[PDB]
């Protein structure tokens, strides 16, 4: 333990813009020394819910690979990011497996994302034909057909555009304002170590 290297958690957490729900960006973290002391200590964290490891004994474990996912959802939907849940956003946008390892951090961000004039660049999928598998992403915007008759070209009857737009304004009460969500995933003790920090004394 010297230590010199530093993982870029800040770059994950202090980005100017996060991606939409249906196109969440996944970042790899490797070949660095991870320091969670600056992470958990920060003030405005709302829900630091952690599943496979205790949120304090992170610093004494060495991880084979770390992946970070970030997006922005409504406050009411934050409970749907836990494993085993079921809903519109837990079936059509993003779901976690039943054997999940790693854990999640969600914090309110109404001061930055929302605009008084109307922010219309945060989309989410509303229709789909079947439930998706864990950690799967799709981007295609093919016109979803509902009737038994085939559809093509432009929308109309039983031909709906599968993406709507969030309406984020400061006037909305608690439960509709955006909550920035970050999910960390990793594996334990089956491969050569790549990411871990020093143990304090």
């Amino acid at each position, epitope marked *: 333990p010297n230590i010199t290297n530093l993982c870029p958690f800040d770059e994950v957490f202090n980005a100017t813009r996060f991606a939409s729900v249906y196109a969440w960006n996944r970042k790899r973290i490797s070949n660095c020394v991870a320091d969670y002391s600056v992470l958990y200590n920060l003030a405005p964290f709302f829900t630091f819910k952690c599943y496979g490891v205790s949120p304090t004994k992170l610093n004494d474990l060495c991880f084979t690979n770390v992946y970070a996912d970030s997006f922005v959802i409504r406050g009411d939907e934050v409970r749907q990011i836990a494993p085993g849940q079921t809903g519109k956003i837990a079936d059509y946008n993003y779901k976690l497996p039943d054997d999940f390892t790693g854990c999640v951090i969600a914090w309110n961000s109404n001061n930055l994302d929302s605009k008084v004039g109307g922010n219309y660049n945060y989309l989410y999928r509303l*229709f789909r034909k079947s439930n998706l598998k864990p950690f799967e992403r799709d981007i295609s915007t093919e016109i979803y057909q*509902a*009737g*038994n*008759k085939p559809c093509n070209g432009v929308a*109309g*009857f039983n031909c*709906y555009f599968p993406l*709507r737009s969030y309406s984020f304004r400061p006037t909305y009460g608690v439960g509709h304002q955006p909550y920035r969500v970050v999910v960390l995933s990793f594996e334990l003790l089956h491969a050569p170590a790549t990411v871990c920090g020093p143990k304090k004394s």
Partner: antibody
Framework: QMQLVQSGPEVKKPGTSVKVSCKASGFTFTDVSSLQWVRQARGQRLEWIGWTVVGTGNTNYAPRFQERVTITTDKSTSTAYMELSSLRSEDTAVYYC????????????????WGQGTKVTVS | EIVLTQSPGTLSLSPGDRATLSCRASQSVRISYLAWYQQKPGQAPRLLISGSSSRATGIPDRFSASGSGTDFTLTISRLEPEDFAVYYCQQYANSPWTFGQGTKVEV
């Protein structure tokens, strides 16, 4: 059984605004269901108002009603609302709301269900 | 935007014969987005045939729809004493939807 019940007969004065509702019975608007509004006199041609999708919220209007009518939906209690402004004495008619059988996966292509009709008289 | 002219205006056949009705448009033609309703006196209209191949639930096998281009035709095998009412054509595909004019069938 599956059925839609509307409001009661209404009498209104010229100039003011009117507000009409129709709600399902043993039936939910879910997410794919549509709903169209029509207007019809005493034994004359059917007139079309507009239709809205409860899910995406996108709406459509006839060019004659582009300025003085509003269509609204409510998933909470599964109801549909029309708001009409600047009523006139020649608008005395019956208004209907229609929607097909439809539940959460995929559904029909014809306006099967129809309302009981509410008489709106202006004088 | 589109208009659906109906014909003939009035039809009068004995109960038991086959009857036919036609409605035609002028602008762009769509096939599977046509429906035929009937309005009993004083009550809301009900769906009979839609999509030219799928009938409504509970409607008997008597009615039959067809038509490919501008013209569309509805055929009734026989006239039961309750089958006397007005008929309307409707389309969904094109610009703001419009209804037909209304034809009556007599005995």
């Amino acid at each position: 059984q599956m059925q839609l019940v509307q409001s009661g007969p209404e009498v209104k004065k010229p100039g003011t605004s009117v507000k009409v509702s129709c709600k399902a019975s043993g039936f939910t608007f879910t997410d794919v269901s549509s709903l169209q509004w029509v207007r019809q006199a005493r034994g004359q041609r059917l007139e079309w108002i507009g239709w809205t999708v409860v899910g995406t919220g996108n709406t459509n209007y006839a060019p004659r009603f582009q300025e003085r009518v509003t269509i609204t939906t409510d998933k909470s209690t599964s109801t549909a609302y029309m708001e009409l402004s600047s009523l006139r004495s020649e608008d005395t008619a019956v208004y209907y709301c229609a929607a097909p059988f439809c539940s959460e996966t995929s559904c029909s292509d014809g306006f099967d269900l129809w309302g009981q009709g509410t008489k709106v008289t202006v004088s | 935007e589109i208009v659906l002219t109906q014909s003939p205006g009035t039809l009068s056949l004995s109960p038991g014969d086959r009857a036919t009705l036609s409605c035609r448009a002028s602008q762009s033609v769509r096939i599977s987005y046509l429906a035929w309703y009937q309005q009993k006196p004083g009550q809301a209209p009900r769906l009979l045939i839609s999509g030219s191949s799928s009938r409504a639930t509970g409607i008997p096998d008597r009615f039959s729809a067809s038509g490919s281009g501008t013209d569309f035709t509805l055929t009734i095998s026989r006239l039961e004493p309750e089958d006397f009412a007005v008929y309307y054509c409707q389309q969904y595909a094109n610009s703001p939807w419009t209804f037909g004019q209304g034809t009556k069938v007599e005995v």
